[PDB]
Each structure stands twice: as structure tokens, then as C-alpha cells.
């Protein structure tokens, strides 16, 4: 049978499509076979981290749906996630409830 | 496939941590933009890393070192651990 490369490496995100986007993206003449798998693992990890933080934020409001406010709360309440997204606007995210005398 | 998005895989990833929790359309658009942004960031840094060393191949090590530059602090550590574990599983199969 045929096993997909993402299933081969134990990932949910697509290894083959990440390979294809690297080939046509004008980054280098040659693309090693280990680069798509690494990049896919990193992207899946980052997405899962932000999704789970946003879900925790949504739960504390007795909410089942995730809205951009929960993503904004998740990123701005975290330090490294804030450094990564230092100069990024999130539509409908609002501002943190920050008042200081 | 006229329009390509990551939305099919973000649903799967969210359905592991929170089976009950759903996600809106605008939030999914935001997450698609986030994933595309980080992909282009790391790929650009890896391409520059390969260019500086007079190498024409983006290997797994260029991607590793690009992750270390882009991601701050303990994000880089866990991301390197996650990526290293996936390449090991991929090579053990082959």
C-alpha cells in the first residue's frame, strides 16, 4: 500500500504540500528530503500550541466557539508568543484590559 | 483545488486537544494567515542561511538553524525537539 509522508512521520499537517511549496517558492535550487518533515513538525507544533491556549481561554468564558478575541488573549498573555507576534494586528482582537494608575 | 488552505488540518489538530470546542470562520482565517506567515519566515531565513554558506541545498539543518533564529526562548527548544523526532520517525520507516 501507499503511506503518505505525513503518516510516515506521524504528523497531521501535510508534508507533501510543504515540499511542493518549498520547491516553487524560489528559496533554493535543491530541497532536501528532511526539510519538509522538519518544517511540517514545527508548523504543527506552533499551531497546536496556539490552538490549545485559545481553547483554554474560550473555556474560561464558558464558551464552546473560538473567536479572534480568544486568539488575541492567548498571544498577548504569553511572552514568547508575544515576541513572535510583536508587530502583528489581529482583526477583531481588541486590546488587553490594561489600566495602570 | 482552486484555493488551498490549511483549514482541513487545523480542524484535525483542534479535534485532539478539545473535541467539544469548535472554531469560527474568522478565527480559521487568522490561523491560516499565521501558519503561512511563519512558513515564509522560516523558509526565507533558511534560504539566506544556505546562500551565506555557498550551498545550493536547503537541508534539515538549515531548517533547524532557521527555527532557532526565528522562534524565541522555549518555543525554539520544543520546536527543535518536535522536528527532530519527526525526521527520526520518517527515516526509521525508510
Amino acid at each position, epitope marked *: 500500500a501507499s503511506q503518505s509522508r505525513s503518516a510516515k512521520a506521524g504528523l497531521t499537517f501535510p508534508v507533501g504540500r510543504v515540499h511542493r511549496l518549498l520547491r516553487r517558492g524560489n528559496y533554493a535550487q535543491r530541497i532536501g528530503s528532511g526539510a519538509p518533515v522538519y518544517l511540517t513538525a514545527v508548523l504543527e507544533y506552533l499551531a497546536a*500550541e496556539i490552538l*490549545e*491556549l485559545a481553547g483554554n481561554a474560550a473555556r474560561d468564558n464558558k464558551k464552546t466557539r473560538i473567536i479572534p478575541r480568544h486568539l488575541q488573549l492567548a498571544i498577548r*498573555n*504569553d*511572552d*514568547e508568543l508575544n515576541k513572535l507576534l510583536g508587530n502583528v494586528t489581529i482583526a477583531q482582537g481588541g486590546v488587553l484590559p490594561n489600566i495602570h494608575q | 483545488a482552486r484555493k488551498e488552505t490549511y483549514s482541513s488540518y487545523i480542524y484535525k489538530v483542534l479535534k485532539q*486537544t478539545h473535541p467539544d470546542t469548535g472554531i469560527s470562520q474568522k478565527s480559521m482565517s487568522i490561523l491560516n494567515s499565521f501558519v503561512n506567515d511563519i512558513f515564509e519566515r522560516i523558509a526565507t531565513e533558511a534560504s539566506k542561511l544556505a546562500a551565506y554558506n555557498k550551498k545550493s541545498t536547503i537541508s534539515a539543518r538549515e531548517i533547524q538553524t532557521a527555527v532557532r533564529l526565528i522562534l524565541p*526562548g*522555549e*518555543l525554539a527548544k*520544543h520546536a527543535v*525537539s518536535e522536528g527532530t523526532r519527526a525526521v527520526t520517525k520518517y527515516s526509521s520507516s525508510t
Partner: single-chain antibody
Amino acid sequence: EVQLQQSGPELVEPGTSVKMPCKASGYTFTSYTIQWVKQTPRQGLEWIGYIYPYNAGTKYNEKFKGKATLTSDKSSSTVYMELSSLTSEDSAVYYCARKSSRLRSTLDYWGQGTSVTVSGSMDIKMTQSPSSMHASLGERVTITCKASQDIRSYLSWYQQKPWKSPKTLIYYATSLADGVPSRFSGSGSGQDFSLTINNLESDDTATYYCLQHGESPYTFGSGTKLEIK
């Protein structure tokens, strides 16, 4: 190369409040939370709460709400825990330990500890199967920590020698903590996890705890004190 300096032992009468610091050096102070843990012989290890210096955000255990208060001072790089309305049972050793904001990372560095003496249904209970076990050198040893509810992979194994701060062995139930010999291995997911020591040594005599941080209150294990004859 990080050290969480902690004050010396102090003895108080009932009713007079105590303040204990967590002086942190060797890392960016705002990027990591500071966790506070109580150790007694009657109940073992318990989690009081944490403070996040970056936004001065706190979270407490249900038992210790109103009995502990967490503050931070970024200028002095210090975190204080203050106990009020003391009782003879407040006598314990209070460790201050740092944990990164990452959902996967564990309580990775512990303070020296400070010893003071005064002169919940839905919380997951974590059950260690061997309360004690004897094993010769060079033999395989296994420890089992079952879980009351499902925790995905958020379980870490700690080794504490007598009258010393605990040492982190494995986080995320498989990953080996940095600076730990490869003899130690972890396994499991869901509710069944296990710690395996492959080649025992002279100094491998200590108590071994399972800690879960899947849900809001973190609960330590019962304890398992390896002994070697």
C-alpha cells in the same frame, strides 16, 4: 546555569505572618512562571500556586486560597510568597520552582527550599503502585503512576533525595530532562504511565514522584522510595 536562591529557616509563633523570597538569576525573569510547592510528611508534596512575572498574573490551589498571596518585583527580580493566619500545621518546607509558560514544559528548576515551623473532590488523584521496593545494582526497576482522569501526556517524574530539593527526570512523559543520564526512561499516555530505571547505582536511593499538570490544580504523586541493598 539558573539558581533560585531562597531564604534560611525561620520559626514563628501562631498568628505572625511570614514572607519568603524567590531570588532568580541566570535567565530572563519575565518569561517563566514561579511555582510554589509545599512538602510535609503527613501528605507529601502539594501545589500552592504560581505567579507570572510578565503580567503579574496568579493562580492558586483551592485549598490554599486566602492562606497564600503571591507578589513579584521585577526591579529586584524577586518573587515573594506570604502566609497569613498561621497554624501549627503550616509547619513545612516551601519550595519555589520555575516553570516555563509552555504547555508542555515542567517545573524544571527548584529552589534550595526554606523550612518553617509554627510553635477537593474533582482534583485528579495520582496513584503510585509500589510504595517502596528493594532492588540490587544493575537490575530493571519500574514505577507506575495511574491517573484518576485522562491527561494526554502532561506528566513528569521527579527524584528527591532526603532533605534536598527535587530533581527533574522526565517531562511530557517521555522526554528526558536536560542533564539526566539516559538510563532513565518514561512511557505511557492517557492514564497509565511508568518510570523505568535500567542500571541502578549507589546514589539512586531516593523518592520518586509523578506530577501531572494537565488540569487546573497540579497534583503530585503519593511517592515511591527506592531502596538498594
